Write an enzyme that holds these catalytic residues in place. Structure first.
Site, PDB file in Angstrom:
ATOM      1  N   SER B  27       0.812  -1.211   0.000  1.00 31.43           N
ATOM      2  CA  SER B  27       0.000   0.000   0.000  1.00 31.43           C
ATOM      3  C   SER B  27       0.852   1.272   0.000  1.00 31.43           C
ATOM      4  CB  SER B  27      -0.954   0.023   1.196  1.00 31.43           C
ATOM      5  OG  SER B  27      -1.663  -1.197   1.331  1.00 31.43           O
ATOM      6  N   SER B 105       2.954  -7.185   1.529  1.00 28.44           N
ATOM      7  CA  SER B 105       1.842  -6.573   2.268  1.00 28.44           C
ATOM      8  C   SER B 105       0.527  -6.776   1.483  1.00 28.44           C
ATOM      9  CB  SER B 105       2.172  -5.091   2.541  1.00 28.44           C
ATOM     10  OG  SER B 105       1.214  -4.491   3.403  1.00 28.44           O
ATOM     11  N   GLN B 106      -0.173  -5.696   1.100  1.00 27.12           N
ATOM     12  CA  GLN B 106      -1.361  -5.856   0.252  1.00 27.12           C
ATOM     13  C   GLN B 106      -1.002  -6.581  -1.030  1.00 27.12           C
ATOM     14  OE1 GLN B 106      -4.861  -3.430  -2.182  1.00 27.12           O
ATOM     15  NE2 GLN B 106      -3.633  -2.292  -0.667  1.00 27.12           N
ATOM     16  N   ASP B 160       5.762  -9.083  13.228  1.00 28.14           N
ATOM     17  CA  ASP B 160       5.028  -8.446  12.133  1.00 28.14           C
ATOM     18  C   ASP B 160       3.581  -8.877  12.380  1.00 28.14           C
ATOM     19  OD1 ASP B 160       3.749  -7.555   9.810  1.00 28.14           O
ATOM     20  OD2 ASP B 160       5.322  -8.183   8.461  1.00 28.14           O
ATOM     21  N   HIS B 173       7.645  -5.307  10.050  1.00 28.10           N
ATOM     22  CA  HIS B 173       6.949  -5.227   8.773  1.00 28.10           C
ATOM     23  C   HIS B 173       7.764  -4.386   7.788  1.00 28.10           C
ATOM     24  CE1 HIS B 173       3.522  -5.583   6.112  1.00 28.10           C
ATOM     25  NE2 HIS B 173       3.516  -4.275   5.934  1.00 28.10           N
TER      26      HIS B 173
END
Ligand SMILES: [Cl-]
EC number: 3.1.1.74
Lengths: 199, 199
Positions: B27, B105-106, B160, B173
């Site tokens: 993101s 991530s996303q 994370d 993260h």
């Protein structure tokens, strides 16, 4: 409009307030009241008078840690016992004081959890509770468990993703300022008023 | 080390690459590869040669929107069809190219979802997939659905919180840089190598 208030802790058993406000801030927020606490307090003060209300933010073991949001109840066990203790100190110092509470974000999860765990008779004395950006809104169906819906006022904005089962912080999560200045204190003042009086 | 790579899109059916890398950023990240994409690419390039590998970030309808993390699969339907399309363009332009993918991530939710939805025969050609800060790690039990565990390498750091059912971004993260430079590309190179050759 100061971000740290310890009126209950530094409260005087011999000069009891008539209303006690216990408030939990959001993650990373300043003092023990953060961004919203002071706005509700000032409003409560004009309605009850500066000596009509003890204002207490949840400090101590509540560190308002971001990662703690990720715990099962949305905050730490330590934070929960810190706020449960404050409710109990209120019950003890001022057994005739009306109780009110609130929290923003992790603070709203913290308020909900502490009230869930409170002795039912202390919890009986919490006339109203306000919650902003309630991180367990979806998981608890807009309720605080063990606590009546008519004593509960949840400010959860459209597009505040924390109110719909997420921990993503979108812009509406940041827009509770006018609720904290207006409809929230109004709800608290109006719950307290309706439980005090000779009637 | 550039953050936008469109080698598949600007790829030439007449000068096909032998390896095609399709990568989804996290993101708000820059270009179509973000922070980790370039490190994996450069490493893939030295192993396959600069003409041995087409590098493709997922751009287009994938806007890497923060709020989209809050959707059921961890990204939008649009993003998912954008990445599914890229896999298909690969299958069409270069039917003999080995496929590899990843995301952060996303992007890792996006990669997992697209691979879940892919035709099983295109998906058969994805020798390896790397995922960093995999936001559906807990929900999918460290797997990409419909895709073999031995083709899957998940970099999910201790602490994370996105890897353990949350969307809170803690410090680990942010620490995938050395995985993207090292063990991730190594895994991809070693999956591709083990599927090419006369053997
Ligand atoms: Cl942030």
């Amino acid at each position: 409009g100061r971000t740290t208030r310890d009126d209950l802790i530094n409260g005087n058993s011999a000069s009891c307030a008539d209303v006690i406000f216990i408030y939990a801030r959001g993650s990373t927020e300043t003092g023990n009241l953060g961004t919203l606490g002071p706005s509700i307090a000032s409003n409560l003060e004009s309605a009850f008078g500066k000596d009509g209300v003890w204002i207490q933010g949840v400090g101590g073991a509540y560190r308002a840690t971001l990662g703690d949001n990720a715990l099962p109840r949305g905050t730490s066990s330590a934070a929960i016992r810190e706020m449960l203790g404050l409710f109990q100190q209120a019950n003890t110092k001022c057994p005739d004081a009306t109780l009110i509470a609130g929290g923003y974000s992790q603070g709203a999860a913290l308020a909900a959890a502490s009230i869930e765990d409170l002795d039912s008779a202390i919890r009986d004395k919490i006339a109203g509770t306000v919650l902003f950006g309630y991180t367990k809104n979806l998981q608890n169906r807009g309720r605080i468990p063990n606590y009546p819906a008519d004593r509960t006022k949840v400010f959860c904005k459209t597009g505040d993703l924390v109110c719909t089962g997420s921990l993503i912080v979108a812009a509406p999560h940041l827009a509770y300022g006018p609720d904290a200045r207006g409809p929230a204190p109004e709800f608290l003042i109006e719950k307290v008023r309706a439980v005090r009086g000779s009637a």
